[PDB]
Structure formats: C-alpha cells, structure tokens
Design an enzyme around this catalytic site. Sequence first.
Site, PDB file in Angstrom:
ATOM      1  N   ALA A  44       0.640  -1.089  -0.450  1.00  0.00           N
ATOM      2  CA  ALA A  44       0.403   0.027  -0.126  1.00  0.00           C
ATOM      3  C   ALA A  44       0.549   0.978  -0.303  1.00  0.00           C
ATOM      4  O   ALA A  44       0.559   2.177   0.042  1.00  0.00           O
ATOM      5  CB  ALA A  44      -1.418   0.245   1.449  1.00  0.00           C
ATOM      6  N   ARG A  56      -1.237   0.923   7.837  1.00  0.00           N
ATOM      7  CA  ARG A  56      -0.640   0.267   8.554  1.00  0.00           C
ATOM      8  C   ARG A  56       0.028   1.412   9.195  1.00  0.00           C
ATOM      9  O   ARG A  56       0.973   2.217  10.026  1.00  0.00           O
ATOM     10  CB  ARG A  56       0.109  -0.907   9.116  1.00  0.00           C
ATOM     11  CG  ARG A  56      -0.743  -2.136   8.934  1.00  0.00           C
ATOM     12  CD  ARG A  56      -0.439  -3.509   9.345  1.00  0.00           C
ATOM     13  NE  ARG A  56      -1.058  -4.671   9.349  1.00  0.00           N
ATOM     14  CZ  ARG A  56      -1.787  -4.925   7.640  1.00  0.00           C
ATOM     15  NH1 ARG A  56      -0.914  -4.849   6.820  1.00  0.00           N
ATOM     16  NH2 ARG A  56      -2.475  -5.952   8.030  1.00  0.00           N
ATOM     17  N   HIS A 124      -4.319 -10.417  -3.281  1.00  0.00           N
ATOM     18  CA  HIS A 124      -5.823  -9.698  -2.647  1.00  0.00           C
ATOM     19  C   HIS A 124      -6.828  -9.046  -3.639  1.00  0.00           C
ATOM     20  O   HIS A 124      -7.812  -8.990  -2.830  1.00  0.00           O
ATOM     21  CB  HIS A 124      -5.389  -8.496  -1.784  1.00  0.00           C
ATOM     22  CG  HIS A 124      -3.737  -9.174  -0.651  1.00  0.00           C
ATOM     23  ND1 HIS A 124      -3.263  -8.352   0.374  1.00  0.00           N
ATOM     24  CD2 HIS A 124      -3.269 -10.356  -0.899  1.00  0.00           C
ATOM     25  CE1 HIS A 124      -2.591  -9.136   1.256  1.00  0.00           C
ATOM     26  NE2 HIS A 124      -2.260 -10.567   0.420  1.00  0.00           N
ATOM     27  N   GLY A 198       7.176  -0.364   0.054  1.00  0.00           N
ATOM     28  CA  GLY A 198       6.173   0.261   1.000  1.00  0.00           C
ATOM     29  C   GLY A 198       5.241  -0.850   1.318  1.00  0.00           C
ATOM     30  O   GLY A 198       3.567  -0.841   1.091  1.00  0.00           O
TER      31      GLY A 198
HETATM   32  N1  LIG Z   1       6.150   6.976   0.419  1.00  0.00           N
HETATM   33  C1  LIG Z   1       6.052   5.891   1.179  1.00  0.00           C
HETATM   34  N2  LIG Z   1       7.461   5.268   0.354  1.00  0.00           N
HETATM   35  C2  LIG Z   1       8.261   4.398   1.772  1.00  0.00           C
HETATM   36  N3  LIG Z   1       7.206   3.506   2.544  1.00  0.00           N
HETATM   37  C3  LIG Z   1       5.984   3.936   2.286  1.00  0.00           C
HETATM   38  C4  LIG Z   1       5.571   5.187   1.633  1.00  0.00           C
HETATM   39  N4  LIG Z   1       4.310   5.087   1.976  1.00  0.00           N
HETATM   40  C5  LIG Z   1       3.491   4.459   3.440  1.00  0.00           C
HETATM   41  N5  LIG Z   1       4.912   3.345   3.001  1.00  0.00           N
HETATM   42  C6  LIG Z   1       4.951   2.368   4.246  1.00  0.00           C
HETATM   43  O1  LIG Z   1       4.663   1.255   3.410  1.00  0.00           O
HETATM   44  C7  LIG Z   1       3.984   0.429   4.777  1.00  0.00           C
HETATM   45  C8  LIG Z   1       2.696  -0.220   4.251  1.00  0.00           C
HETATM   46  O2  LIG Z   1       2.935  -1.749   4.692  1.00  0.00           O
HETATM   47  P1  LIG Z   1       0.984  -1.759   5.697  1.00  0.00           P
HETATM   48  O3  LIG Z   1       0.107  -0.316   5.233  1.00  0.00           O
HETATM   49  O4  LIG Z   1       1.295  -3.135   6.009  1.00  0.00           O
HETATM   50  O5  LIG Z   1       0.442  -2.491   4.224  1.00  0.00           O
HETATM   51  P2  LIG Z   1       0.624  -3.873   3.168  1.00  0.00           P
HETATM   52  O6  LIG Z   1       0.611  -3.787   1.356  1.00  0.00           O
HETATM   53  O7  LIG Z   1       2.307  -4.367   4.094  1.00  0.00           O
HETATM   54  O8  LIG Z   1      -1.055  -4.385   3.580  1.00  0.00           O
HETATM   55  C9  LIG Z   1      -0.929  -5.910   3.756  1.00  0.00           C
HETATM   56  C10 LIG Z   1      -2.456  -6.091   3.488  1.00  0.00           C
HETATM   57  O9  LIG Z   1      -2.892  -6.304   4.563  1.00  0.00           O
HETATM   58  C11 LIG Z   1      -3.924  -5.137   4.721  1.00  0.00           C
HETATM   59  O10 LIG Z   1      -4.679  -5.854   5.361  1.00  0.00           O
HETATM   60  C12 LIG Z   1      -4.472  -5.017   3.263  1.00  0.00           C
HETATM   61  O11 LIG Z   1      -4.919  -6.665   2.660  1.00  0.00           O
HETATM   62  C13 LIG Z   1      -3.126  -5.400   2.425  1.00  0.00           C
HETATM   63  O12 LIG Z   1      -2.852  -5.718   0.905  1.00  0.00           O
HETATM   64  C14 LIG Z   1       4.172   0.558   5.811  1.00  0.00           C
HETATM   65  O13 LIG Z   1       5.171  -0.009   6.350  1.00  0.00           O
HETATM   66  C15 LIG Z   1       4.456   2.162   5.664  1.00  0.00           C
HETATM   67  O14 LIG Z   1       5.478   2.583   6.545  1.00  0.00           O
HETATM   68  N1  LIG Z   2      -3.099  -1.179  -1.149  1.00  0.00           N
HETATM   69  S1  LIG Z   2      -4.349  -0.256  -1.999  1.00  0.00           S
HETATM   70  O1  LIG Z   2      -3.209   0.616  -2.002  1.00  0.00           O
HETATM   71  O2  LIG Z   2      -5.339  -1.096  -2.700  1.00  0.00           O
HETATM   72  C1  LIG Z   2      -5.798   0.278  -0.678  1.00  0.00           C
HETATM   73  C2  LIG Z   2      -5.364   0.757   0.206  1.00  0.00           C
HETATM   74  C3  LIG Z   2      -6.199   1.753   0.703  1.00  0.00           C
HETATM   75  C4  LIG Z   2      -6.941   1.475   1.230  1.00  0.00           C
HETATM   76  C5  LIG Z   2      -7.488   0.626   0.300  1.00  0.00           C
HETATM   77  S2  LIG Z   2      -9.720  -0.301  -0.130  1.00  0.00           S
HETATM   78  O3  LIG Z   2     -10.588   0.703   0.565  1.00  0.00           O
HETATM   79  O4  LIG Z   2      -9.994  -0.625  -1.448  1.00  0.00           O
HETATM   80  N2  LIG Z   2      -9.554  -1.606   0.955  1.00  0.00           N
HETATM   81  C6  LIG Z   2      -9.864  -1.161   2.381  1.00  0.00           C
HETATM   82  C7  LIG Z   2     -10.586  -2.293   3.072  1.00  0.00           C
HETATM   83  N3  LIG Z   2     -10.478  -4.266   3.361  1.00  0.00           N
HETATM   84  C8  LIG Z   2     -10.988  -4.997   3.775  1.00  0.00           C
HETATM   85  C9  LIG Z   2     -10.172  -6.418   3.712  1.00  0.00           C
HETATM   86  C10 LIG Z   2     -10.880  -7.228   3.503  1.00  0.00           C
HETATM   87  C11 LIG Z   2      -9.950  -8.731   3.634  1.00  0.00           C
HETATM   88  C12 LIG Z   2      -8.412  -8.324   3.707  1.00  0.00           C
HETATM   89  C13 LIG Z   2      -7.641  -9.126   3.625  1.00  0.00           C
HETATM   90  C14 LIG Z   2      -7.304 -10.580   2.393  1.00  0.00           C
HETATM   91  C15 LIG Z   2      -6.501 -11.463   2.452  1.00  0.00           C
HETATM   92  C16 LIG Z   2      -5.388 -11.155   3.390  1.00  0.00           C
HETATM   93  C17 LIG Z   2      -5.179  -9.964   4.335  1.00  0.00           C
HETATM   94  C18 LIG Z   2      -6.110  -9.127   3.956  1.00  0.00           C
HETATM   95  F1  LIG Z   2      -6.079  -8.157   5.756  1.00  0.00           F
HETATM   96  S3  LIG Z   2      -8.134  -6.755   3.743  1.00  0.00           S
HETATM   97  C19 LIG Z   2     -10.148  -4.019   1.408  1.00  0.00           C
HETATM   98  C20 LIG Z   2      -9.583  -2.785   0.762  1.00  0.00           C
HETATM   99  C21 LIG Z   2      -6.918  -0.266  -0.501  1.00  0.00           C
END
Ligand SMILES: Nc1ncnc2c1ncn2[C@@H]1O[C@H](COP(=O)(O)OP(=O)(O)OC[C@H]2O[C@H](O)[C@H](O)[C@@H]2O)[C@@H](O)[C@H]1O
Ligand SMILES: NS(=O)(=O)c1cccc(S(=O)(=O)N2CCN(Cc3ccc(-c4ccccc4F)s3)CC2)c1
Length: 282
Positions: A44, A56, A124, A198
């Site tokens: 993200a 997060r 996802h 990220g």
């Molecule tokens: N511009 C930036 N440059 C560098 N790091 C960044 C920036 N902006 C944000 N970050 C970092 O980017 C990191 C984003 O970490 P998380 O927010 O856990 O996202 P995920 O993709 O790992 O979440 C996994 C799944 O969990 C969810 O439930 C959904 O299902 C997701 O698909 C952070 O540690 C920030 O410090």
């Molecule tokens: N990363 S992003 O740039 O595409 C992004 C960032 C912020 C918000 C969104 S969202 O508004 O489209 N939305 C917010 C609520 N989420 C509920 C979940 C339901 C199930 C989840 C899950 C599935 C499998 C493994 C672990 C999990 F945590 S996460 C879905 C995405 C998208």
Amino acid sequence: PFTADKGKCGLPEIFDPPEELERKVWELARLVWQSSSVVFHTGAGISTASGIPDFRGPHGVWTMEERGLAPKFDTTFESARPTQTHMALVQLERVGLLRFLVSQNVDGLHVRSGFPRDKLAELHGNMFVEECAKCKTQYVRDTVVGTMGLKATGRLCTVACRGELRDTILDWEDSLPDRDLALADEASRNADLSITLGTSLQIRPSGNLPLATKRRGGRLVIVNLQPTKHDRHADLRIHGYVDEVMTRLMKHLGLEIPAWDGPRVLERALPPLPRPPTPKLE
Ligand SMILES: Nc1ncnc2c1ncn2[C@@H]1O[C@H](COP(=O)(O)OP(=O)(O)OC[C@H]2O[C@H](O)[C@H](O)[C@@H]2O)[C@@H](O)[C@H]1O
Ligand SMILES: NS(=O)(=O)c1cccc(S(=O)(=O)N2CCN(Cc3ccc(-c4ccccc4F)s3)CC2)c1
Ligand SMILES: [Cl-]
Ligand SMILES: [Cl-]
Ligand SMILES: [Cl-]
Ligand SMILES: [Zn+2]
C-alpha cells in the site's frame, strides 16, 4: 472479521540521512546490475503519493480505526494516477530488469499503468476486476466493481455463458487466488534479488514470499518508511519515500520513467527494449 488480527499499526517511521540514503540507492543499483532474476513485491506504501492511504502507516486505514479516527482519501480509485514508482516498474519490466511483480494492492494501479498482467500477481485482488464463477473469464472494468468479498456484482458473463460475475477482493478468511500465488512463489524462489516496496510484510503468505529468494543465497532489499516483519533477513534496508528511492535508482540505471497514457490494460509483456550497458563493478 470484527476481531481479525490487523497486526502492528502506527509504528514510528525511520528516515535514513541523505548520505546514507544516497549510498544505499547506489548499492541497490549495484545489486540490480549483478542480478539475473529480479522480483519486486509492492504494498500500500507505493500508492500513498497518489492519495490512497496505506493500512498500518501513521495515518493508515487500520491505524486510524485503532485510534477511533477515519482514513483520508485525496482521490477516488477511478481518478488515481500511477506514481513515479508505478511507472518506474513499467520501464524496468520493458528493458528486462524486472522478471515478475507481486502486489498486495487492490487499487488496480499496476494494471492501469500498462504493466503486463502475465508478469503480475494480484495476490489480494483488483477492485476493477470481476471474474465469471463458471468460465473464470476476468473483465478489467474502467470503474470499481461495487462489491468486495468475492460477491455477485449483478452483471453476467458475455463470453459466447451468462455466468455470475463476482469481485476478486479477498475477505480476511479467503485464501489467495491459486494461479497468482503459484506464479508469485515460483518467481520468488527462482529470483536472486527480491526488492520489497511500501509493504510492512505482516500478511501471510504474501509478506513471506520475498524470504523464498533468500533460499540458495538470493539477496533481499526492503524499501519502507516503517519497520517490517522481516527487517532482520534483509541484505539492505532503505528508510525513505519509495518515489525518491526509485527515481534515484532509475537515474543510476540510465532509464527514463515513461509517461502515463491514462488507463490502459496490457495482457501480455511486449518484447524487451534496448537497455544501457552495465558498469564495471568489481
Ligand atoms: N511513500 C512511501 N514510501 C515508503 N514507504 C511508504 C510510503 N508510504 C507508506 N509507506 C510504508 O508502506 C508500508 C505499507 O504497509 P501496510 O500499510 O501494512 O500495507 P501492506 O500492503 O503491507 O498491507 C498488506 C495487506 O494488509 C491489509 O489488510 C490489506 O489486505 C493489504 O493488502 C508501511 O509500513 C509504511 O511505512
Ligand atoms: N493497498 S491499496 O493501495 O489497494 C488500498 C489502500 C487503502 C484502502 C484500500 S480499499 O479501500 O480498496 N480496502 C479497505 C478495506 N479492505 C478490507 C479487507 C478485506 C480483506 C483483507 C485481507 C485479505 C487477504 C489477506 C489479508 C487481508 F487483510 S483487507 C479491502 C481494501 C486499498
Ligand atoms: Cl473510489
Ligand atoms: Cl515495451
Ligand atoms: Cl471485503
Ligand atoms: Zn463465463
């Protein structure tokens, strides 16, 4: 679902000072030049600079929820533009320096950037993508599919089928799409360089795939403002904005970041483009 473990939220951000950051981006360039098979892992954090909050980070969706506050969007998903990081990844694929791209992002920006779907795992789901329950045919729409959790969208299949179209957005309990996970795992195991951008790497199995690169002596780079679950395992940790890192990396590689034409879908990777010759390293 209400009680779903949302992991460690709102950890403090780390910033490498400029000279340390410059030195680490040069070492990332050196690793890209030396590697035969490079796999990128995105979360993200690569979409925050287009107005989509992460999960997060300090103002993440889960972080804000934990503190009884709301996340803030500076865009709609439809109006969102791919970041410099998104478009860098397009070019690194075109010149053959990226073998595969594994993303936890449902924001659809990798697909809309023109990145080839046959080199992308969307672990996802994709909020612009609906899939027929019968024939498994996928439709990449110009607007968000209005449901989440693999539900009926209300539309029917138009393949020469009238199957139920469903969203591809995984709920907490839903296991990953088998094809995307299999390809992502194969790409990660065969890689000699995995670079994470990220993502805090807290979600299984998505966050564990980059560790598979460490098998048979592969290298792991983690680019992230916050700590990640696997910081201990990284050959190189870069604490900086991913757009600053990727723009300085492209500059070292002698590559331009291409213009975005607007939303375009590319199913299949085009033939590799010419790239600059490699520096003498050792
Ligand atoms: N511009 C930036 N440059 C560098 N790091 C960044 C920036 N902006 C944000 N970050 C970092 O980017 C990191 C984003 O970490 P998380 O927010 O856990 O996202 P995920 O993709 O790992 O979440 C996994 C799944 O969990 C969810 O439930 C959904 O299902 C997701 O698909 C952070 O540690 C920030 O410090
Ligand atoms: N990363 S992003 O740039 O595409 C992004 C960032 C912020 C918000 C969104 S969202 O508004 O489209 N939305 C917010 C609520 N989420 C509920 C979940 C339901 C199930 C989840 C899950 C599935 C499998 C493994 C672990 C999990 F945590 S996460 C879905 C995405 C998208
Ligand atoms: Cl939206
Ligand atoms: Cl091309
Ligand atoms: Cl959901
Ligand atoms: Zn169908």
